[PDB]
């Protein structure tokens, strides 16, 4: 309503973008800790299985 005192979409959208950035930071920190792109089976299943077998 642009004057509503019960809600505001700006805060929700700002929250969503902040959480997106936090998830990206999680991924990069994982990449740094392990030293490789595909560490677990969640990153990429096909390539992970291939590397294990190889």
């Amino acid at each position: 309503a642009l004057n509503s005192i019960n809600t505001n979409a700006g805060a929700m959208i700002a929250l969503q973008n902040l959480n997106g950035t936090n998830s990206e930071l999680t991924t990069v920190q994982q990449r740094i800790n392990t030293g490789k792109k595909i560490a677990s089976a969640k990153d990429n299943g096909a390539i992970w299985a291939t590397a294990k077998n190889q």
Partner: protein, 164 residues
């Protein structure tokens, strides 16, 4: 607004599904390492120039590692429900505020699941030549099942974001 409250109810189930799949993946990584080591042992024992007293040591190593795989597989339960022991055929989580489900099939990785067959060894230097291939097939199918589990986990994450 009742429906928004219901979405709030759905997100926790999606998160619980993620957790169970992580436990399964950890156990699966341990199992794949053990299977590699078992292949190495069987390959080493397939040699016909070997002494009579080294074959027994390699066999006992093999047996220990198989028992280890079994323990590692049956202990991978979160909240009493698991998708790696082989207890149930599939797990269904909430995905919609009306009850429609997200289905995750069960990918057994226990000794029976990968065809290894517990209490299965090699008594002579010839059964090892086939145990090599048996362990190769076992490792292949185990890695395929774990890749499928990882894919399902990524799917759960994406749908959770969308629900938010």
């Amino acid at each position: 607004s009742a429906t928004a409250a219901s979405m709030n109810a759905v997100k926790d189930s999606l998160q619980r599904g993620q957790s169970t799949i992580d436990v399964a993946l950890a156990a699966g990584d341990t199992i794949t390492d053990l299977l590699g080591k078992m292949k190495e042992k069987a390959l080493a024992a397939s040699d016909t120039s070997l002494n009579t007293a080294s074959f027994n040591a390699l066999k006992s190593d093999f047996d220990s590692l198989r028992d280890q795989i079994e323990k590692a597989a049956t202990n991978a339960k979160f909240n009493g429900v698991s998708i790696a022991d082989g207890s149930t055929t599939k797990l269904t989580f909430l995905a919609n505020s009306d009850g429609s489900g997200f289905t995750v099939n069960a990918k057994t990785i226990s000794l029976a699941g990968i065809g290894l067959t517990t209490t299965s060894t090699f008594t002579t230097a010839a059964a090892a030549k086939t145990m090599i291939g048996t362990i190769d097939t076992a490792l292949q199918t185990a890695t395929n099942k774990l890749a499928s589990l990882g894919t399902s986990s990524v799917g759960l994450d994406t749908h959770l974001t969308f629900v938010g």
